[PDB]
Amino acid sequence: XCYXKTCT
Numbered sequence: 342x343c344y345x346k347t348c349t
């Protein structure tokens with residue numbers, strides 16, 4: 342998930 346550039 343890139344939800345806040347978190348790109349997990």
Ligand SMILES: *C(=O)C(CNCCN)CNCCN
Nearest residue numbers: 342343344345346347348349
């Ligand atoms: C979120 O985008 C992640 C994939 N990592 C980013 C680059 N491939 C997939 N979903 C989160 C992990 N379960």
